[PDB]
Design a protein around this ligand. Structure first.
Ligand SMILES: O=C(O)/C(O)=C/C(=O)c1ccccc1[N+](=O)[O-]
Ligand SMILES: [Mg+2]
Ligand SMILES: [Mg+2]
Length: 704
């Protein structure tokens, strides 16, 4: 066996060498002190980690029996009796300190990217700045009506619409004293203020404070930098450029400050099932903190001249979080003496936290300037599970020699037992917490699994509008604002998965900042630059203070189970949900299992590209597992559907292995089936157990 004994642990050698040879040098941490720390932390914390996991099963079993023997007073009383619904703590204010401004103050988009893909992770870190011309010209925010269609070459009819769109943005964000930007013919900086040339007059900024800087000579600058609600707009000025030639002010582009923070994902969008997989993950995370990851390279910072005349710089990179995995899974990258696998979550803290120290120091220019290590922790259930994550970070800080509370924690509110105790979860981390975020996809899967025995749920799509989720979204903001999150921590909302439907994202996702969210999740750098628009039209700081003190969601609203009313569907409706669910499951799982791809675009039954990840997978299989459980469909239907959709997914992928015609010969196909047929028996509906096992089994038979 290629393992390394360290006390009670047997470290997979690939991981052993990587830490010693790549992650520890630079940190001043003695390798044997590190590995005695791993050993000791694993030994001391693994038992409660397991106790907490058993707490989950015991609660779900009591809820199961309860349903099997719809009064809300009784339900609330029973949940209280079994310790599911814990009392509300007294009002309080978080004490988290040492946090960078991108999280305390600035409201804006938040990109999430799979850390196992270096080209993506680089573009995400770079997406702090994004071309708005590119985002309007490339997507459907400029519709492709007659004459405005994208071709192989530039469509100036379309590009002129792009200019016109952006001009209206400039007018509505950084207004002139009089006139419009569309009538601009030039820009100069004189006596520290910005003067815009109009045809017949010459106006300046209504709020000249919105003037932030410029590059080049003030006599005629190369760009003009503006600020509005804490976010920067940079007008690029280049007449002999291709777009600028046509522009009335020689404007070449409008750069938006976009992905303020980026989450490098080790969880639901990657497939890492062994030390080989985690080491690729960790290595990329290291190359991000060290600054030297190259596929494409991290951008330098941006240089400006202040309106006064001095120089200054702004970060060229998005402030990086890392999303660890949660308390459930173990990974054989480390086994113990008895052969038991070590909990993956404990390992990510040790290893991503260690690696993140490189981001606190100068790179051959930094991540956090204030000394924090920003860790999203997902899939927690209740305040005890938070206090445990806190304790884990405390022991890792000791092993790493970091000051206490260096390791900050972005709380995912995405599990029902966290929602209905959210105040207490925020309090458990009152000195560590940097955001709460509504992980609404995960949170729907737990909604289905928790009440699986109560009856059939409503269709997947009906769920984004059910009472419980509207209540959960408001309750989240109310709790964050109440804990004093405004000006201290982020209040975050969820991912826009329709990667191609950018006109719809620009039309509807504005709902999130309007709901008091200082950040919300985007799937691409482009989506971040287009979601940046909403923070220029919504004053989130104002919105949050208008909200402060409100209580908009009662406990009964949150506990409104999404049961389907009595005989609410026709055959064509039931079949379509099944077909649409089976195809999303298949199209995702087949790339997970056969190729180790943790996120990919899979077009639903209506041909809309949906960015799929493990959370949308938990919804699909849990819903179908629930309809199967309550008679809505037969096992014939599930198999017919899985078989009808399998060859379509083959077509959409046509170096990959088809699933049809020999379905029971495809490991990926059998995994899809198991996720459904076993779905009711996976803990809390979690898909990693089936996914990790089937991925491991494909890698093994591929090696033989
Ligand atoms: O609802 C939550 O549980 C949540 O955390 C969702 C996401 O993670 C997500 C969902 C679909 C695609 C891509 C991502 N992503 O983050 O990259
Ligand atoms: Mg404003
Ligand atoms: Mg999630």
């Amino acid at each position: 066996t290629d393992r390394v004994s360290v006390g009670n642990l047997r470290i997979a050698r690939v991981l052993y060498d990587f830490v010693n040879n790549e992650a520890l040098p630079g940190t001043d941490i003695d390798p044997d002190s590190f590995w005695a720390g791993v050993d000791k932390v694993v030994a001391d914390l693994t038992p409660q980690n397991q106790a907490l996991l058993n707490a989950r099963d015991e609660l779900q079993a009591q809820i199961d029996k309860w349903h099997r023997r719809i009064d809300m007073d009784a339900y609330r009383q029973f949940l209280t009796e079994i310790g599911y619904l814990l009392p509300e703590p007294d009002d309080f204010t978080i004490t988290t300190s040492g946090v960078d401004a991108e999280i305390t103050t600035t409201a804006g988009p938040q990109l999430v990217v799979p850390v196992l893909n270096a080209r993506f992770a680089l573009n995400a870190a770079n997406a702090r700045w994004g071309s708005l011309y590119d985002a309007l010209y490339g997507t459907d925010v400029i519709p492709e009506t007659d004459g405005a269609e994208k071709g192989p070459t530039y469509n100036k009819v379309r590009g002129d619409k792009v200019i016109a769109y952006a001009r209206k943005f400039l007018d509505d964000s950084v207004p002139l004293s009089s006139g419009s930007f569309g009538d601009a013919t030039g820009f100069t900086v004189q006596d520290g203020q910005l003067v815009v040339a109009l045809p017949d007059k010459s106006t300046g900024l209504a709020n000249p404070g919105q003037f932030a800087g410029y590059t080049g000579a003030a006599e005629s600058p190369t760009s003009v930098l503006l600020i509005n609600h804490g976010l920067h707009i940079e007008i690029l000025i280049d007449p002999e450029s291709q777009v600028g030639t046509t522009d009335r002010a020689g404007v070449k582009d409008v750069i938006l400050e976009s992905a303020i923070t980026t989450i490098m994902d080790f969880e639901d969008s990657v497939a890492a099932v062994d030390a080989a997989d985690k080491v690729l993950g960790y290595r990329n995370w290291l190359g991000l903190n060290k600054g030297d990851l190259a596929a494409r390279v991290l951008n330098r910072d941006r240089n400006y001249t202040a309106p006064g005349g001095g120089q200054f710089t702004l970060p060229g990179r998005s402030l990086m979080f890392v999303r660890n995995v949660g308390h459930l899974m173990t990974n054989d990258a480390i086994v113990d003496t008895d052969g038991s696998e070590v909990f993956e979550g404990i390992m990510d803290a040790l290893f991503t936290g260690l690696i993140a120290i490189h981001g606190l120091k100068a790179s051959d220019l930094i991540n956090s300037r204030t000394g924090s290590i920003y860790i999203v922790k997902p899939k927690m259930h209740g305040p005890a599970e938070v206090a445990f994550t806190c304790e884990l970070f405390s022991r890792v800080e000791d092993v790493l020699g970091l000051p206490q509370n260096t390791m900050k924690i972005g709380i995912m509110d995405e599990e029902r037992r966290t929602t209905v105790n959210l105040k207490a979860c925020i309090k458990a981390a009152a000195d560590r917490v940097v955001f709460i975020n509504t992980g609404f996809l995960d949170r729907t899967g737990d909604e289905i699994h928790t009440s699986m025995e109560a009856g059939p749920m409503v269709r997947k799509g009906t769920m984004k509008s059910q009472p419980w989720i509207l209540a959960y979204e408001d309750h989240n903001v109310d709790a964050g604002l109440a804990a004093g999150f405004s000006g201290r921590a982020q209040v975050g909302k969820g991912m826009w998965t329709m990667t191609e439907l950018m006109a719809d994202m620009v039309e509807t996702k504005i709902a999130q900042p309007r709901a008091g969210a200082s950040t919300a999740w985007v799937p691409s750098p482009t989506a971040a630059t287009l979601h940046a628009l909403h923070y220029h039209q919504v004053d989130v700081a104002a919105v949050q203070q208008g909200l402060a003190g409100k209580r908009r969601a009662t406990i009964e609203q949150l506990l409104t189970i999404p049961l389907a009313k009595e005989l609410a569907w026709a055959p064509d409706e039931i079949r379509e949900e099944v077909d649409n669910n089976c195809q999303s499951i298949l199209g995702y799982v087949v790339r997970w299992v056969d190729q180790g791809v943790g996120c990919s675009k899979v077009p639903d039954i209506h041909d809309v590209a949906l960015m799929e990840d493990r959370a949308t997978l938990r919804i699909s299989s849990q819903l179908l597992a629930n309809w199967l459980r309550h008679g809505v469909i037969t096992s014939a239907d599930v198999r017919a559907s899985l078989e009808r959709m399998a060859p379509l997914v083959d077509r959409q992928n046509a170096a990959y292995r088809p699933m049809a015609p020999n379905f029971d010969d495809s490991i990926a196909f059998l995994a899809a089936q198991e996720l459904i047929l076993s779905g009711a028996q996976q803990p809390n509906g979690y898909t990693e157990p089936i996914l990790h096992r089937r991925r491991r089994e494909f890698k093994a038979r591929a090696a033989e």
